[PDB]
């Protein structure tokens, strides 16, 4: 600890998670649902 930052001493998919443009919340907000197999999308 230097009072400013921290100093401490499969993978290709992990790299894909880091470079994600849209957050899962914004992905979730744009989602819509339909009821009774035909209706106005509630989302």
């Amino acid at each position: 600890y230097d009072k400013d930052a921290v100093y401490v001493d499969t993978h290709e998919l992990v790299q894909s998670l880091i470079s994600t443009h849209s957050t899962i919340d914004a992905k979730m907000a744009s989602s819509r649902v339909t009821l009774f197999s035909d209706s106005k999308p509630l989302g």
């Binding site: 600890y1 930052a5 921290v6 100093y7 401490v8 001493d9 499969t10 998919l13 992990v14 894909s16 998670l17 880091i18 994600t20 443009h21 849209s22 957050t23 899962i24 919340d25 914004a26 992905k27 979730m28 744009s30 989602s31 819509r32 649902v33 339909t34 009821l35 009774f36 197999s37 509630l42 989302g43």
Partner: protein
């Protein structure tokens, strides 16, 4: 040596949690997550100043390290930081199955090693033991778990499932991580996954509560009026003090009959309030006190706070009060008998719940875990004396409703402020919403539709219901609120059976939906059916054993797991209507899955910014879905006069009644059937 910067957001999150006395959640991804716990534990020790943090480790079947000092030595027979961490830190190891042992004690940090085996019962019990600024760490070591995370974040609708059981609860767990305030996903290296959408705005708080301020005011103002003041000084939270004053107010009344009800769920101090209330009665002229519980071993904290109330206000350990212990191997260390002779002669005695006799000369009787005693037994313990009743949240409500109707004075007090941490914790609110362990206090009234004539049953889709969409979440909450409000006991695990268990179907009864309506129709009745036999449960096995019938067991039929009607609408006939619609459906009178991802296509999928694939509808008409042909229908329930009349009217015929009653409810399980083989069984 070359060193890597760690993003300050990790340190910012930890420091804010300790200062706010609120826990935070960490989700490590990768097979090297064990080394991540070592770094996260050490950073927690730097922020915390009270003590060296304690670590709770939970695993399902296999632990990589030995956890035995001699054994881990010979396995090694150059230096690993993980080996230092295990030997230095105080770690308590517990199993997923054996999680009941760690219920009472408190730990600084909790580690959930195995993600795929997570169950609602495990989550509620382990997270509760975390205190203050501690960390809850969840690991995703398996490659299957990693790619499930990959598919959801790439496209919210598409999901990956191998081959059996869908496991929607794990997917629902993944989606809910975004909503949580204090959630930080990290990798094998100290790298944050930017998916919660709130991690970007995390900032350090600048360097005490409204409820805590009031308690200090009470602790100063109640020095004037005492010995009620001494017990409040022993109290830790505000809402505990208010219950204490309510108990002593009931004690001082010049009435034979008076009831104070303590209505506090887990995590909030409940036995402590009872213990101080007993000491307050001992402080007064009360002589004969009885304490009732299903087991003497259950009440140990209650007698502790009686001693703390005793120790605070004279009552030396030997010169004033003498305690007689269990002196038995079974139910050991329980203090059944407490005798205090400072003020004339006063005695506190523990008795079995089935001891309506020996209560002839009673002034105060305290009933704890009152829900856990059979219902008829509670009535016998009422009597003409003062009674203290404490029941944990999460019928007993019918009894207190009768007490509101009455003679016996009623006082209702509830606890909402947790002892271990500060109110308003983000982890707790997220945890309860995920498990649906909370019910809305007030339910809006709606118009009553005509009963046996104009309601049609609908088929709820399991896949669409558990998706985290806002409309689906409200509908699931409405169903679950009615699902647990029935006479059936509520358990957090039942949500997993709705979500994961196969051969389970959900049907809901609705009012006639107008062409122009709101987002969600009101639900009147919810019914669950599990298919058995040719299409291995209680109904097939018990009949086969008892009646030694060979041809039976090749028949196909389902049992009604649960049937529910809204309490305001109860007793007017939605329940009978739903059963009739099932029979026409399964007899064939009515004229007759979300996109899965291939194993090799998990990497091939790219980002879809706006979802495109059409989702399966939430509710389906009975005509649209084809029906399976069922020979019979069954139900298993604890035999009660109210339910027996209901099922006989619907055509269900008893075949079996269990010899020994259930321990908790005192009811005999009964099996009924409806369709010439039934004639043989009935005779």
């Amino acid at each position: 040596m070359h060193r890597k910067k760690v993003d300050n957001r990790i340190r910012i999150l930890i420091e804010n949690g300790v200062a706010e006395r609120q826990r935070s959640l960490f989700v490590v991804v990768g097979d090297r997550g064990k080394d991540q716990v070592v770094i996260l534990h050490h950073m927690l020790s730097k922020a915390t100043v009270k003590a060296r943090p304690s670590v709770l480790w939970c695993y399902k079947k296999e632990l990589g390290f030995s956890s035995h000092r001699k054994k881990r030595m010979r396995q090694l027979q150059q230096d690993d930081p993980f080996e230092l961490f295990i030997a230095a830190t105080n770690i308590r190891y517990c199993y997923y199955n054996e999680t009941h042992k760690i219920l009472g004690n408190t730990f600084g940090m909790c580690v959930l090693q195995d993600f795929e085996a997570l169950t609602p019962n495990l989550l509620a019990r382990t997270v509760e033991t975390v205190e203050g600024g501690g960390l809850v760490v969840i690991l995703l070591r398996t490659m299957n778990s990693l790619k499930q995370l990959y598919t959801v974040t790439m496209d919210v609708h598409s999901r990956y499932r191998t081959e059996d059981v869908v496991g929607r609860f794990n997917e629902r767990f993944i989606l809910s991580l975004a909503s949580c305030k204090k959630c930080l996903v990290i990798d094998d290296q100290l790298n944050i996954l930017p998916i919660s959408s709130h991690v970007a705005t995390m900032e350090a708080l600048p360097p005490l509560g409204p409820s805590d301020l009031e308690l200090r005011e009470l602790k100063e103002s109640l020095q004037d009026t005492q010995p009620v003041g001494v017990l409040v000084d022993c109290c830790k939270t505000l809402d505990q003090a208010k219950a204490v004053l309510k108990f002593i107010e009931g004690i001082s009344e010049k009435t034979l009959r008076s009831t104070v009800a303590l209505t506090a769920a887990r995590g909030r101090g409940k036995s402590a309030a009872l213990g101080l209330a007993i000491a307050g009665a001992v402080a007064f002229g009360y002589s004969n006190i009885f304490v009732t519980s299903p087991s003497p071993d259950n009440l140990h904290t209650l007698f502790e706070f009686v001693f703390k109330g005793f120790d605070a206000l004279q009552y030396q350990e030997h010169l004033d009060y003498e305690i007689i212990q269990s002196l038995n191997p079974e139910f050991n260390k329980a203090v059944i008998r407490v005798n205090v002779f400072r003020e004339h002669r006063q005695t506190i005695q523990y008795i079995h719940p089935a001891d309506a006799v020996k209560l002839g000369q009673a002034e105060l009787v305290v009933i704890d875990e009152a829900a856990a005693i059979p219902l008829p037994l509670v009535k016998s313990l009422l009597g003409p004396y003062l009674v203290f009743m404490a029941s944990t949240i999460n019928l007993s409500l019918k009894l207190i409703q009768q007490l509101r109707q009455q003679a016996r004075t009623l006082y209702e007090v509830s606890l909402q402020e947790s002892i271990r941490y500060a109110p308003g914790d983000a982890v707790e609110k997220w945890l309860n919403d995920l498990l649906c362990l909370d019910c809305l206090n007030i339910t809006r009234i709606v118009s009553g539709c005509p009963l046996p004539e104009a309601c049609e049953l609908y088929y709820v889709n399991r896949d669409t219901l558990f998706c985290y969409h806002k409309a689906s979440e409200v509908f699931l909450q409405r169903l679950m609120a009615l699902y647990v409000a029935s006479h059936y006991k509520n358990s957090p695990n039942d949500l997993q059976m709705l979500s994961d268990a196969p051969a389970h179907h959900l049907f809901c009864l609705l009012p006639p939906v107008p062409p122009t309506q709101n987002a969600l129709p009101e639900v009147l009745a919810v019914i669950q059916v599990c298919l058995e036999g040719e299409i291995g449960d209680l109904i097939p096995w018990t009949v086969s054993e008892q009646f030694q019938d060979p041809d039976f067991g090749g028949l196909s039929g389902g049992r009604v797991v649960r049937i529910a009607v809204h309490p305001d609408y109860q007793g007017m006939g939605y329940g009978s209507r739903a059963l009739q619609l099932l029979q026409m459906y399964y007899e064939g009178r009515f004229p007759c899955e979300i996109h899965t991802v291939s194993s090799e296509a998990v990497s091939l999928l790219e980002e879809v910014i706006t979802p495109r694939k059409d989702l399966p509808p939430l509710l389906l008409k009975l005509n649209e879905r084809p029906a399976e042909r069922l020979d019979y229908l069954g139900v298993s329930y604890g035999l009660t006069p109210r339910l027996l009349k209901f099922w006989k009217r619907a055509g269900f015929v008893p075949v079996y009644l269990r010899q020994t009653p259930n321990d908790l409810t005192g009811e005999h399980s009964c099996i009924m059937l409806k369709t010439g083989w039934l004639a043989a069984f009935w005779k």
